[PDB]
UniProtKB/Swiss-Prot annotation, chain F:
Signal peptide: none annotated. One of its GO terms (molecular function) is cis-regulatory region sequence-specific DNA binding. Disulfide bonds: none annotated. Keywords: DNA-binding, Repressor, Transcription, Transcription regulation. This is Deoxyribose operon repressor.
Length: 179, 180, 183, 179, 179, 178
């Protein structure tokens, strides 16, 4: 589970949040720790597509919360839109916080489920700043559903310094590493 | 909190209308979750809703394919209000829509407390194939500020006991089936 | 002059009518120069929702910091600066107001409540059919007058608010029809 | 502010108005200049959803003015219909004049408030010709409420030629630029 | 199952095909009769998303057959794209031929399966002319998956003149009825 | 060489684990791999040819994906026009490849160049690369070059190839299964 590592990376990712921003939060067990770490006095607007992520936003007294609806999928408790992403097409989030099961220089960022790709792809195209929040265990892993190339992300946040391969790759692509 | 026993009986009767593989719409409130709980746990069905407690009840049904209408979250009745285009809901023509109402009045119609619930209630009233209002005996004669529509918009009104003769006569004249 | 005395009579009736507003109620305000004084007299700390169909009524609601204001749109008409709804399903059919506050140019025991403009009857009749409590707010000069547009029988109003008690025939009619007179 | 630039762009947009047309005017401080530029002898029907826009139409002696009613929102003094589906039924404007706080090739046209999206989306679905009227400062900006892709607009009107990025996108997508 | 009626409506729909057009064919047992009715000498490009439709196109010597890929669903043997936003982004068919289980004046065109809506919605958004081909039994029926309002279709083709309420709706909405 | 192809295909099928995401190349060898997978093993598969898809369609526990595009009669394949629609969404656990030639110098080759865009996609995105060829493919040189043999982690055949291939496989750390 690496809960302690996820919580530390998420706390560092939360330092990027500014008052009145519109934020996108991906699914999984890492992003809810970002929501918890945001000071409860900071007002913000948030969009999400998973039950545990929404329930975390619901506990923030100054969060204007939006949920992308659709068919419920038990894995990661997500909602998958039938086709058009009406709710999401109304936003250009200041920051999108992403989750991934794998981070690979050649293969890119991957996840376990294809059902999560439509919303992750929407965020990658419509958000203004892309922040991948992943514990150290995700580096070097490759899962079967592909989100995209690592160059799609502006910042990668983790619990400790990634291997030298990712440090050098991040320098070349101007990807900021926070750990 | 109050009239749970009555809400349970109305829900029990409403659940008998469900048939296998139907697409069902469930309104917000504390009555409709009891309908979902009363449905045969072995019957497969597809359900559409727009509120958190309604969705959580559908999630507990092993053979329910559940859809949630998204949008802005409103604390009252824990609903989701679409910004404008009802994308998820525009994909459905439910076999049965189960509605909630704070008031049932012969001339003013069915009413609720919150205007934010009217867009999805009006959608169901235009797109569902059968309209079933599920209300306890206390809703009859009450009028709240947000108007859902005329009682002739419903095919069936389900309650825990027979309403006053005023509603029996009205339902008989309008061809509205009363179930209690 | 006669203009200033008319405003203070309307303001006195409107100030008394404002005492009926309770927190979180949904209110309807009619058109004219009496209803804006009701809106102004409501405690600025009381939250409420209000629907109207005229520009001056809307502008008065806009000044209330805790008023959730709704304006019935449509085509604009110069007299009383009203909006004629094309479709009542747009805004008005969504409401069953807790209280409807009405204006009238005439109040008569047999001819009923009347106004000058037939164009205002569609919205006035809508409110009379859908609101939960009906409050007619009129200065004393309106009693006994009969204008061409008929709103309805005086018995359709739960409360009639004026700047002074009307003549005995109105007091007796109110007792027979269970109309509360406020003055 | 840029009042002179807004007036010059709006004056150019007004040249598209023909007698007896039905026009939609968006909210903001640019569209009132289009209304001012229309010849006073030209009769037309107009629909709007904001107080300042309506007051400008009321001042036009040969304008049959319609106001889209609903809940009042102080920002831009707009009215938001209770039910988007019942917005201005049976109105099919010949031209819709739109406002935007941001014009971006990838993110599209954006505005500051989500409460303005329902009537803007109504016009985008019902109007026969879509004209975006924006001063040069809107180009490159991305605001939190998204109206739609720039290809949703038939014409983009401005006070001067925008950067080559926009001239190129308009040329490839066949979007007319007027300046 | 009115196969002769489906074949008659399909033959009439086939008269709209012109050489070198790009055509979309919906799933079901009505559209394959349109494909059979097209002269085997007429060259054309076909887009489909179902196995039986594809196998019918594969036999047309001058047809360039394109298959919309994705996840296979046994009902109607269709393919559902992983991400609707990336579906056939380069095609703008001259004509889209649609299927429907229900044709209703108020509720619109409906089908039985939600998995068919993404490609049906893609065609409705990208094709230049929309032609619904339905036998007389579809009129008045309502199924649970909604494709859209009847006004989304330019032409409705059937095996006989439908009931007066459909003739009136079509006249008012400018929908051409072919039978 | 149906018996030889089934022999090699059956050996290749022993590599499949439940719940894996697999890529199956075109040709008449890969459908025999699909046939050999136990019908009770659940798996997800992506392909780009008609016969390969029809083979997946017969597996009751296979979640089947077909990469679309323009149909091409030879090897009955689909030529993708947009890699973003289906293929770029996958990083398969195992890619099972076909080839008409296996040569130390010329590498793995096929007859049709229309197959290279999808084969090259698989070679770059799959996690494990398994070339399944009967003994007759060794030493042949066809006109469409897939890539050097070192790009494949495993080469599955129906019998031991000539010593030149055994030694080359050892120097490249390629596993030979036969
Ligand atoms: Cl009057
Ligand atoms: Cl709102
Ligand atoms: Cl595809
Ligand atoms: Cl190399």
């Amino acid at each position: 589970r690496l809960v302690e590592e996820k919580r530390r990376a998420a706390k560092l990712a939360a330092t990027l949040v500014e008052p009145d921003q519109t934020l996108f939060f991906d699914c999984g067990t890492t992003t809810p720790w970002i929501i918890e770490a945001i000071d409860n006095e900071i007002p913000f607007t948030a969009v999400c597509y998973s039950l545990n992520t929404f329930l975390a936003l619901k506990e923030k007294p100054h969060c204007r919360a939006f949920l992308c609806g659709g068919e419920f999928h038990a894995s990661n408790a997500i909602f998958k839109p039938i086709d058009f992403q009406q709710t999401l097409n109304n936003f250009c989030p200041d920051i999108a916080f992403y989750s991934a099961a794998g981070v690979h220089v050649s293969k890119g960022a991957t996840c376990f489920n294809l059902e999560e790709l439509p919303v992750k792809h929407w965020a990658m195209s419509m958000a203004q700043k892309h922040v991948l929040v992943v514990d150290h265990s995700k580096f070097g892993k490759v899962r079967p559903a592909r989100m995209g190339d690592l160059k799609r992300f502006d910042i990668v946040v983790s619990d400790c310094c990634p291997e030298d391969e990712y440090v050098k790759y991040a320098q070349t692509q101007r990807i900021k590493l926070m750990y």
